[PDB]
């Protein structure tokens, strides 16, 4: 019964008041359902996006179930290009969703300002989208509502990273049963969804529509109104007949055509679309990538000794929940590069190749490497870093472990971390509090023993804020 530390186990765990952790700054949006508030974490000064929902806004029993469901999706997801959920709170009359703040606004608005995207630009953007959804599709989640309106740029830099959002029409899927609900948006929605039977491939279609727009500034299917769009769509025919397309390379068209294959069975999957030459070829050579960053990350990984569960959870919390995007930009690069097959996980092969790739850049000769020795080392790294024990290194796990410990173990982070564990505010962490954070009924006497003998200096049977400090700060 291996206690799996996952980013998501931290989410619903606090049941404090909004004001116990946050200070509002301004309103980011109001809707009939609720408002999004820009808040400042009182302790860390970091800036978060808090959606605040009145119980009265959503007391449709389906609706409570619907929201709770979007929450469980988000708790599960963890990918550099997909929205990150930090916390879910409850009030006497309110629910709170603490999300990361994405300061770049909608891809839509960036569309209506420059109109057309560079082939380089568009490939990079679309690459990210498909990686998001490859991940989602792998994990049996289909979005059903892709569009520039539901993609945000993280910040304002020229080639900023992209994040997928509003999982309110998203759902779980089992390959054996096809979905039926008619959900989506005029310009982007795939024929089969109109017909009432569809699969996750609709997300590919939508992405294909998105890509058409990026390259030409126009939808491939248009209409006087929604209805006229839908008819155009359902009939299925589109064309590269616009003058704009004269400039654009044939493979890009080829990808577009493979993504807008009318019948889902013949339409390319996300995984496979990722391998399209264009996405492949738009990278003319590896962009200049810091070897030092790469070397240090690989070094910070090797030296993560396997560890007792209290520290593991602590670190995963700090990595997954307390790190600013500015903070992890370079890392998420390396991760993505490491993750050839796009699915947002590192596996033994991908990790092993990473180290080898690094070696040659160090100029080391590849036929001169004790391959069976690397493998072993890699097997052990995975054992050490795989906090949820699924045999894969996920992005949160990666960031936790790849970040400079000194940087990550900032004092604010440390304080706050202890705070989350010590639910009774007693200043002392009980095994019961540990079990609670893990999401489990009780912790094995085994595991508690194996943690105290390494942290409990007073020997009072519990872990206080300084015992905590030393444990982690013990390099
Ligand atoms: Ca992978
Ligand atoms: Ca894992
Ligand atoms: Ca306590
Ligand atoms: Ca103690």
Automatic annotation (TrEMBL):
Q: Which residues cross the membrane?
A: none
Gene3D superfamilies recorded: EF-hand (1.10.238.10), Phosphorylase Kinase, domain 1 (3.30.200.20), Transferase(Phosphotransferase) domain 1 (1.10.510.10)
Enzyme Commission code: 2.7.11.1
Residues annotated as binding ATP = 51
- Which positions are annotated as binding Ca(2+) 1? 339, 341, 343, 345, 350
In this chain, Ca(2+) 3 is annotated as bound at 422, 424, 426, 428, 433
Q: So which cofactors does this thing need?
A: Mg(2+)
The record's SUPFAM superfamilies line, in alphabetical order, gives:
EF-hand, Protein kinase-like (PK-like)
Task: Please list the residues that bind Mg(2+).
Answer: 150, 166
**In terms of domain of life, where is this protein from?**
Eukaryota
* Domain EF-hand stretches: 326-361, 373-408, 409-438, 443-475
Catalytic reaction(s) noted? L-threonyl-[protein] + ATP = O-phospho-L-threonyl-[protein] + ADP + H(+); L-seryl-[protein] + ATP = O-phospho-L-seryl-[protein] + ADP + H(+)
Q: Which Pfam families match?
A: EF-hand_7 (PF13499), Pkinase (PF00069)
The segment(s) forming the Protein kinase domain are: 22-279
An MF annotation (GO) of this entry: calcium ion binding
For this UniProt record, give its keywords in alphabetical order, as a comma-separated list.
Answer: ATP-binding, Calcium, Kinase, Metal-binding, Nucleotide-binding, Repeat, Serine/threonine-protein kinase, Transferase
Q: Which residues bind Ca(2+) 4?
A: 456, 458, 460, 462, 464, 467
Which family, according to UniProt?
Answer: Belongs to the protein kinase superfamily. Ser/Thr protein kinase family. CDPK subfamily.
Kindly provide the name given to this protein in its UniProt entry.
Answer: non-specific serine/threonine protein kinase
